[PDB]
Design a protein around this nucleic acid. Structure first.
Lengths: 93, 46, 241
RNA sequence: GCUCGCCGGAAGACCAAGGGUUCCUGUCCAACGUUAAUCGGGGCAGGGUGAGUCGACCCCUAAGGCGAGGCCGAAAGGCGUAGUCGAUGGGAAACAGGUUAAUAUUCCUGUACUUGGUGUUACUGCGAAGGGGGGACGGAGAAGGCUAUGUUGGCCGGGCGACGGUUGUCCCGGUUUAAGCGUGUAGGCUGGUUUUCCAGGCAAAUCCGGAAAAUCAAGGCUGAGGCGUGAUGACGAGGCACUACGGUGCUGAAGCAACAAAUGCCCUGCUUCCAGGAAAAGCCUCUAAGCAUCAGGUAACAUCAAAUCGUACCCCAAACCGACACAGGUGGUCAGGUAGAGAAUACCAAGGCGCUUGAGAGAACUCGGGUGAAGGAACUAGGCAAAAUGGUGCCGUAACUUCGGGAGAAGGCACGCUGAUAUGUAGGUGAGGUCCCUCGCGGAUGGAGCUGAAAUCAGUCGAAGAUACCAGCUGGCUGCAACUGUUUAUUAAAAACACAGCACUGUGCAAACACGAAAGUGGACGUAUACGGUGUGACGCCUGCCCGGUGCCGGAAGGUUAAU
RNA sequence: AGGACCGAACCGACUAAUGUUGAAAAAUUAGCGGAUGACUUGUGGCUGGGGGUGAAAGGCCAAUCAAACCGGGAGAUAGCU
């Protein structure tokens, strides 16, 4: 299945927010914006082989893009997936 | 009083869906002429 | 047996009920239920071709055999059932070998009776055998015009046909309509006569009877025979009088 | 922050279709709000939807669609086999509380549950596009129990009342706790155990069915609820310490009994009934070729996985359809208290709102109502509109009639509170104990506490005692129509329509007729007591005479007659 | 049981009024019938215009119908304005 290029490319970047900080300080959970497909197994493998930290359970959700119409010009945001990763053992950023 | 227009995605896509239109040769000609005209949306965007 | 309901109120004020206690009460033989339920009286194109029809209460279809190919295997009649599809009542025959089937119940057939088909069957009502061995002058029901089908004539309630003579390979039959016809003798025949003959006694009580029987109301908008076959003239002797 | 008012079987809350970010935060008032708009469903920037246990998705399915081959049609084109799509149904599994400004049964503590793969333990007949078991089904009725729910008693902790009394039979808030596990009761269903044989279940079959026998009549199946675990847990008012006044940590006792009761369950059940009320998949038996030390299956053991999609927001409205922030329409579920027959009506519990222009003036006139001395349809084409009774139980109730009805005919009798019968009556609900007892989800028992209907007498208050809302005016004559019902959406809701019944006529199965150029289809997987067409329209007395002409039937010595 | 009565939800508005450049291109006020079936409704499909369907009004087929809409014949023709 690895093919580590797929694991490298699956995840886009972490997400910073008040809810993300609360989750990190409560359950050591990491919120990551990932690729479109971003399958659970792929993200699990990417986290395991990239951050060198065990993952307990992975939760994923899709965030719909907003609309920023500029006046007779409707502009819709792109589509990205948000994934929650719980380590339970890695005390890292 | 109940209005004539009752929105229904299933009904709309079953009566004027892309596959339903393409199934009959008449719908194929309709699609071809709509493309020739240059309509942004041929039948519907789901 | 007919019971006249008292005139409690219009709409079943003057109804006539044709009830028969001996008929079995309960669910039918489930393994013999299939499709061909109420079709709504609509053709493939969906046009109105048989006007004044539609709706009707849901009714399952029971497969009923008429060929009676089971010969030499006596069967015992267990119970009688009312088939909604056909006016005539049916009876559940269990063969000695374990086959359970439905056969139109004649008037002389009651629960707990033995029926045997074949050319060697005794000459009594309820048996089935080719009409070649049927003595002339005995009334028959559920007659077969062509071998292999089984009972294409006289299947409605209280229908009988009287044999007048054989006159060669063919046999002359007198239909209830009052016409003489020539039929191949090799066809299978069923002895006895069909059961309950009180179909006309019931008056359906009110509109709802016919309405849920599948007959839609008729809306208002003579001596001209439309028979044009020119193929069965030799088979038929004379028309009805 | 408080007062007053409305809804509260909604104007409340939760879901699916509906719109697709309007949801929360900080920021701005040009336009958007029928008014000013710091506010907002208006603009800008950021955040928000966490699933093996929700649903979709997905194996196989109804109506219906496509349709390999094939048939038909000059071609587009029509039907249709196998096959394949197609829910509005059928198939596996989760709850207590908390969490953020916005999300949860998705995250946190726990009990747990369904399915597949991987390797091991010991055993062995496994293997179907096939049979069977049930899946698997209609209208109405009901009694007996339980549950949510509500009431009362004790108990827990605080109270002695802005003003006449309020240490007591007084008030305040609570007296809440799941899925699973074993018990398998109430109730319902079935007659079972063993052996031999068989024209059947497309060949076969230990499986189904049938035929014989020996034996018991006590064995099996289904089955709410309650019981202990779940849970020495969760919640718990109210308090004890720290506050950015938004909040955080700790503590914590009662948390038990009785009553009534559902549209919820026992019940896909029992009785009756004609209108006779589907299919397959979800589990198991066996057999076909094959494998028969093999491969597979059996119960357990340790482990892996159960992908993907919406999880915000209103969902009887400001967000959906009506061009609007529109007096309109929108399916399913939750269904509390007071009195009452109720899911109508009157006021309240939790919850949502005072509805997007306000204040004055207090004229005619317009719109909906309150009362009106006397008359009471006399106005009006017109009892049109309004006005009046309106219920309970008892007496009483005419003509006719198909004996059902008329009828609730008409007309009268009492309706509040308190005591007595009876400190709360009969009924119901029902604690402990005597005797035995498979000995506990037992009984002949005997009363603990409560609803307590309905009736007589007495005393008493007011003109009115169903005193609120809700809630038929009554009878006769008379023409029409069997009654109930259906259309003129948007001038005529009927004296029109059909209607159950009756009469005539046609149809012999490849039936008649229509859709169709034509396959084929409905009739009908029906068979003259069946079906098609026309007339009338229950029931009682009858349907009397006539074939000039038009169709129709049977057909004739004969006159006429095209195609050829 | 009663195509039963009284009567909620629900079902077409029948009756007088409001509105007639309305809140609504058909709703509301107060009475009126059914309210266990000839009953009603959600979800999908079928019947496509010289035809469909119609318990029959020559009703409805997208706020329209004694023959809907779209593009074309077609700038139809007009002894008419």
């Amino acid at each position: 299945m690895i093919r580590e290029e797929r694991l490298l490319k699956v995840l886009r970047a972490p997400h910073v927010s008040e809810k993300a900080s609360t989750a990190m300080e409560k359950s050591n959970t990491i919120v990551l914006k990932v690729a479109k497909d971003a399958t659970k197994a792929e993200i699990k493998a990417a986290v395991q082989k990239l951050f060198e930290v065990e993952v307990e359970v992975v939760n994923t959700l899709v965030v719909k893009g907003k609309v920023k119409r500029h006046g007779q010009r409707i502009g819709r945001r792109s589509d990205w997936k948000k994934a929650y990763v719980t380590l339970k053992e890695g005390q890292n950023l | 009083m109940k209005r004539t227009f009752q929105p229904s995605v299933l009904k709309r896509n079953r009566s004027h869906g892309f596959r339903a239109r393409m199934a009959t040769k008449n719908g194929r000609q309709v699609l071809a002429r709509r493309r020739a005209k240059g309509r942004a949306r041929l039948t519907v965007s789901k | 047996a007919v019971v006249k309901c008292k005139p409690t109120s219009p709409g079943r004020r003057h109804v006539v009920k044709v009830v028969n206690p001996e008929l079995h009460k309960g669910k039918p033989f489930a393994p013999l239920l299939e499709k061909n339920s109420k079709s709504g009286g609509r053709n493939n194109n969906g046009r109105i071709t048989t006007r004044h029809i539609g709706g009707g209460h849901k009714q399952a279809y029971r497969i009923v055999d008429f060929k009676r190919n089971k010969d030499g295997i006596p069967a015992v009649v267990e119970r009688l059932e009312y088939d909604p599809n056909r006016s005539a009542n049916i009876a559940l025959v269990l063969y000695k070998d374990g086959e359970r089937r439905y056969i139109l119940a004649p008037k002389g057939l009651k629960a707990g009776d033995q029926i045997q088909s074949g050319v060697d069957a005794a000459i009594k009502p309820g048996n089935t055998l080719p009409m070649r061995n049927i003595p002339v002058g005995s009334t028959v029901h559920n007659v077969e015009m062509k071998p292999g089908k089984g009972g294409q004539l006289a299947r409605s309630a209280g229908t009988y046909v009287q044999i007048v003579a054989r006159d060669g390979a063919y046999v002359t039959l007198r239909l209830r309509s009052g016409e003489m016809r020539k039929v191949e003798a090799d066809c299978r025949a069923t002895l006895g006569e069909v059961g309950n003959a009180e179909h006309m006694l019931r008056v359906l009580g009110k509109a709802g009877a016919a309405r849920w029987r599948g007959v839609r109301p008729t809306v208002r908008g003579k001596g001209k025979k439309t028979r044009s076959n020119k193929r069965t003239d030799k088979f038929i002797v004379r028309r009805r009088s």
